Amino acid sequence: LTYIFMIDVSLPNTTPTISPHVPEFTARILEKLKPLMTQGIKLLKTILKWLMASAGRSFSTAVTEQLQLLPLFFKIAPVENDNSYDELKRDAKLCLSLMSQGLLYPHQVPLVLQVLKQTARSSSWHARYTVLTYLQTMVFYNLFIFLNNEDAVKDIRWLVISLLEDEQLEVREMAATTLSGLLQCNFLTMDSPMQIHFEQLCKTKLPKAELVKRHAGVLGLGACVLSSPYDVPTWMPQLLMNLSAHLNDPQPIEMTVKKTLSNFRRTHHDNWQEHKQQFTDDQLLVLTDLLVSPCYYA
Amino acid sequence: FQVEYAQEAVKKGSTAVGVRGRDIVVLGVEKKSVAKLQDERTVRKICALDDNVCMAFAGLTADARIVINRARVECQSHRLTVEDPVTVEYITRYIASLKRRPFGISALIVGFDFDGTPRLYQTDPSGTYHAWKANAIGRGAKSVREFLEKNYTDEAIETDDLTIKLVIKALLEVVQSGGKNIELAVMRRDQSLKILNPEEIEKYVAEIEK
Amino acid sequence: MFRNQYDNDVTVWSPQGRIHQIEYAMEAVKQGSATVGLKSKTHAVLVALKRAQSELAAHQKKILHVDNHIGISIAGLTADARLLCNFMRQECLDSRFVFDRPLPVSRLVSLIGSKTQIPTQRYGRRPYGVGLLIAGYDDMGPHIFQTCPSANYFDCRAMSIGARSQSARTYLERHMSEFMECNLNELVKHGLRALRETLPAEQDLTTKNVSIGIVGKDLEFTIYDDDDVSPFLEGL
Amino acid sequence: MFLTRSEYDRGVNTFSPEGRLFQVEYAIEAIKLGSTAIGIQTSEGVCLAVEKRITSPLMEPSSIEKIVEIDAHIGCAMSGLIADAKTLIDKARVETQNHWFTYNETMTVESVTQAVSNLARPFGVALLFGGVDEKGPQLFHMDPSGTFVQCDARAIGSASEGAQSSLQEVYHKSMTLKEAIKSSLIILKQVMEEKLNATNIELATVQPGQNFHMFTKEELEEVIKDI
Amino acid sequence: MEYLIGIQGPDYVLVASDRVAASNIVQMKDDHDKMFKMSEKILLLCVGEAGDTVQFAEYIQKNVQLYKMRNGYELSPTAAANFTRRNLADCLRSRTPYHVNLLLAGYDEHEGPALYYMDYLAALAKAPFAAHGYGAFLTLSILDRYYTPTISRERAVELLRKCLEELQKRFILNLPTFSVRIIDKNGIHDLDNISF
Amino acid sequence: LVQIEYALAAVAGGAPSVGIKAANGVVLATEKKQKSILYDERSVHKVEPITKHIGLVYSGMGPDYRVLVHRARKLAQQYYLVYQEPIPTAQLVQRVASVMQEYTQSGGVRPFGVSLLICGWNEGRPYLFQSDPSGAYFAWKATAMGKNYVNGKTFLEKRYNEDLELEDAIHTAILTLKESFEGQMTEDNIEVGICNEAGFRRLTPTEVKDYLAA
Amino acid sequence: HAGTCLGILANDGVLLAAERRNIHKLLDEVFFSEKIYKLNEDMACSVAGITSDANVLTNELRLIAQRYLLQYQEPIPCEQLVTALCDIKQAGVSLLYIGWDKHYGFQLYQSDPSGNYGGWKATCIGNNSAAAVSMLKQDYKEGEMTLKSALALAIKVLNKTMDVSKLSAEKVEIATLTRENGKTVIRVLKQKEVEQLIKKHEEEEAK
Amino acid sequence: TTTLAFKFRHGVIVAADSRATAGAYIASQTVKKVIEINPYLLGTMAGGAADCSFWERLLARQCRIYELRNKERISVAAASKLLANMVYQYKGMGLSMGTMICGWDKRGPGLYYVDSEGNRISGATFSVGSGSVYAYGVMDRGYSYDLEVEQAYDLARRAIYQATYRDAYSGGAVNLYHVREDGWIRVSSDNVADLHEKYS
């Protein structure tokens, strides 16, 4: 099927060929996969094995009628990506890896971001997880298509931050791993209403939904901490001190502050004699004398 | 890491199919071509472990011959200490725990376990092992196992019709026209392990072609 | 960036005459939670602060029985603390079997520092990443020996080790002249006050995360559980 | 997203200058990968539930049992590989029989968990020991650093931190066993998005009056049809 | 003592043994097979002390069964005799010798039938006929009298019964029942039990 | 096989040694120079006996030779205690070359920087072998090692003829060391050992001076 | 690739055909067992390697061939001696094995250096093996082969793989293994019999 | 000491006395000489008291580890063979054992006399001890394979009584167990002085 549809190229001064079309066929595939969005899951093992073969073996890697095969693939692709899963799951995870690592034309940045904002809106936490791991290897291999369409970098920044508020913990920690990498590759500048959105989210009362609301600021401060692993900027010692104030918080918060500070100290012992000059003497006594040790030291 | 290098020879080694029945259990492997001047006796891949247990393999033929002659001692060192023959799960758990690096083979250990119960197991090279109704190991194992999932229920009425319209019909899904390219094994409950000669192996294919 | 060459193994001297791998193992006693030990010429008291993995879990065995007259206090790897504690228990049993007397607390700590020094000199093995506070009672009175991953050991009037213990060593060095005349219930308050200064201003010494170990003159060594520390935390 | 290594990451018996052992933690971090197991200690027993992850219909489900029987009064659930933990179930089974032979007692759940942890390359599995002792029903977690602790409820596995946050909301210290069987299978429906049947879960409870009991295909059906 | 006997013909290795196992003055089992089959065409009649028989003969039975599994073909009766003689000899200088008196008997497709004898010191001797126990003292001279080398297998059963009637008349132990089986070219059959 | 190729560089830097198998004898001639007049020429010996009938010379490293001359003497007496016959020269070299192979095999131990020339006499037939640091060994009619052995083996191939006697082989062995000597050889600068029906013996220096008058 | 030994199976014997390779002129032409190493009374072998690692591999086969005979008082079957070395090489030279046993008759094997063997009707190992493996596959009646017809095939495929102008009649080492009067005979054929097969080939192939 | 076991159609009976002696002195008469291995096996304590109560408590350990590993109860033919292989390693060192592994398995009723000299034989009827010769003739004349359960209780109960009546080293009280298909049960612990009133 990758050679049945190789002539449909969309080259710049071309003509729609007589040879059969991808949009005329994929619309029929969605008509057969409409109960999913047992005989449709049998059809996925031919579509996924086709989309695995048309990765770099076609002259346009993403026809827009194929892009809504993604929300059907996100809810199937597993999280751990292990050899114990089914062949439907294992071939759906490494089909998403070949589409995210493929290019896209700059008139597809409203079209794929409409899908991923729809897929991670509210379907199931496997789909919210894999949209984040779709994005991190898709706004990197297309990193300057997105930075030209300045309306799109506002939509990535919305989706990553609005998915720190997820009801599933495993989703929101990938949203902070995604945000920490986007800050690191300078896809998202650390503006002031980003930090105001987290610093006015950490100071959140806990009466006993409020726990997941308070945690997402601690993910957000921690995403900024992990974003510069080998430098201490001017904003850096401030959002380590009030990041360290959430150390005696309850336990979903307490792991994250212990992961962020123990990963801080790991990467910042290379030339810490040059990093400690960006700290006050009153702030070195906070970071040096602090418990982030794992369970096997207690 | 090191176990992944074991599995790459299972995916290239010859196919091994086993189903399990009400009274008999059947192995069947793809007898490959050898050479023009190679005597094809020493290249048979259905080995007997004891009187009530035998196994196929797929992978390195060097590391298989280590696994077989270690499992053939534990089939006999069991009888010294227990006097009872091995259960099929005992020698399967022995082979899996035997598999520094694991020995790069995947086996289909079949047989009976002193109460007449039919058994069919699989030692993947990771060290894991579990039960099976019908299974496939080798080069075209994913498609043969998909074929055996389609056909299991009303085949065990006759032990002849169970074990050709499944087993030879599952090798014929991947292997050639047959007769000289199928090594087929069958054992009844507490009789012997009999490898069918190709005068009788071509007999059963003619019923399948009809 | 700064790739040190003299800290692969523990058998490599640096040109400063300073083994880095031993100094890196001494930073592993700063990884555990703080514990305080102190003595009074009557009863010797270990006070410890415990951590839990989560809620719905116990905290930790932080103070361990060694003999009837010796107890220790973990700070560092519990994998190496359990390895030293089975050495100290058996050595106390061997002296109890042979001489039929309690092993002197000064002499067991000498047996640790002979064992602890061996991985700091031979290739492959790593130092014991645990520092013990050892409370004892011998014929010569009570003892608050401290062991370190660097295998020297320290007889102490009082000592706190662990994380944020420098604020607790500051407390104990201010009040160490008053310790030798305290009662039992007064000394443990000084241990709980020393343990208190290792906490933030938004954390409290609850009875769930405080463990107290006491050995003394006629009192055998006994640890105090999640509810038995309540007669010690109430008067505070 | 990006790879940020340090220079103190590839040495086993080597302390990091903050006093860490990163060739221990990175092995332990590489163990939260298998099917999620949840154990809940109640005052009337202790439940043990686990996901199963069967691929083919020809595979018999009764032979990838990731919940085993240590002795008649102690159960155990695994996460990691089923063959990685076979040398920990062997010592736990033998030490309860060494303790029976020598002392004519049932070994307590803490002491089986202590004797298993004394073997600590670290392990590649974390375990949940569920059992009824003289202290009543108890549950012990057995992290791959050889660190063991008493737990009221503890989820292990891939989606553990995230099921543990659900266990904190649903647990209380006056909880019945028929709740915790259903309250954990709510969470197994959360941590994997499939429908429950007799092929994707295994559940086993250890009550005071009864021995260790693995639920059968009828007893698994009568619980899933409630929730 | 327990009783063994073997009569080799041109194509058969007729062997018999008592079915009695005794403690002190009582006898505990009335149907005790002392014959161990090792291949389809060889046996091993083992008597001797308590315990050493079932520990040695089971050791030789599974190590010869291991030869069939590793190779497909079974041992010859001569090589199974020398394999049995090899293990019994080099263990009698060890701390744990065996006090087993053996009578090995097999058929070979090429070499023909064969009866072997060894004592507890493992001195292998191929014999046309042999016997063990205290009852060997009576029954060898019926065999020295009436054995031709070309005796039929039906005249060997009646030669066997003359030896066993001598034990009924003259021997002091009660050996009432005997297990009798033949080792012709078709394998190990099992003749009817000679009993009195 | 890297250290084994480098041990042969330590052999080919060593002093020249020449062995020639005659009709009724074997001759082992070598270079024993001293750096100064201070060295006692007769204190240490390079041509060295193993049995009454086997001797061996080397080219390469001095101290590594003594390990092999101490093992070859043990292996010749472990034969003689068992079989009560003097060891065949073929069987001695199989055991010496197994020792030299045993240090290439095990790690943390460098190979020997020694090639050996092993003469002998068994059953009225002469023998001359050469054991390499690799553990390989070859039977020779005439060969040479040491400095300029490529020039030595081409020199031997022109002046070898299997009908020559033992006295004629001592001349063509000293003439082979003469080509790569760089000096004036006295009775002390070389060491010759001959092996015949009477056994192995290294020549006394007054016996060598008769051969140096040719 | 050093040796050029090749095996050929027939109805009444097997034959090894190795060439004696002499690099330098001053190497002594040894009068000992040169190229075909006899293992016991009914089995021989030949290696594709140097004559020092030959003496390790053959004197290990001879331990296995005599630990068997000490234990069973029968000669070893000619596959178990192949298998027991292939188990030792599984934990670095290729061999051939000719022999006879009462089970599977005349046998020929070829041990890989990895530890794998196989029964061959004719094969080659060593120098220019695939040049002569392909030449045997051209002309070998796989079943209709007499001993002398196999023996003429050997000096045919050796005249196209080794040397110049004489087939090295004093440097080729054919040994045949036959059955005669119940015992087993291993005949390293003499130089007069090895020269006439060159003469019976140079006359038959020129005419 | 006198023990007794016989297989009949409804399982296998185990009978034993209760007296342990010190040469001539009676140490106690309350000895549980039927060693309860686990709910499906049971052995008798004939010979030395420690040498049976150790090696069958070690058998009970080993039969349990078989059950946990292999997910099935050990057969009686194999649980005796474990005991025979354990005590043959100490042959000639002075173990005064001798016992009868009883129980039910897939093969039917199981009964295996195991002695310290290395014997291991199956069989329908056995009797071990110093008064084993006296329990034979009462049991051999009243044995059938097709008894009743109430008849097979009184057969073994009386055959131990006649054994205690002639053997000076056999006495105390009888202990009668019955091994049916779903395990063993204790049916009586009748005193010998109380049996003397009924039988006479």
Side-chain angles (χ1 to χ4, degrees), chain A residues 251 291 293-294 296-298, chain C residues 2 31 51 53 60 76 78:
Chain A
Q251 192 52 251
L291 281 172
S293 300
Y296 64 95
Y297 289 91
Chain C
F2 296 173
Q31 294 291 320
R51 294 187 298 174
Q53 296 185 359
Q60 190 66 39
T78 61

Side-chain angles (χ1 to χ4, degrees), chain E residues 67 71 73 75-76 78-79 82-83 86-87 108, chain G residues 68 70-73 77 79-80 101-104:
Chain E
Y67 192 86
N71 300 319
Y73 49 82
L75 279 170
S76 65
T78 304
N82 291 111
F83 172 66
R86 180 68 170 85
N87 295 320
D108 185 73
Chain G
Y68 192 90
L70 177 60
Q71 195 176 5
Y72 295 160
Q73 295 297 113
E79 191 181 1
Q80 307 181 9
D101 51 349
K102 63 186 179 182
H103 299 91
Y104 297 113

Side-chain angles (χ1 to χ4, degrees), chain A residues 26-30 32-33 35-36 40 42-45 47-48 51 68-69 72-73 76:
Chain A
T26 312
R28 293 192 298 270
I29 297 299
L30 272 68
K32 293 181 179 181
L33 293 172
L36 288 173
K42 290 183 180 179
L43 190 141
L44 285 168
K45 293 183 288 293
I47 296 300
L48 283 172
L51 292 168
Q68 64 266 17
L69 291 171
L72 209 279
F73 294 161
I76 294 172

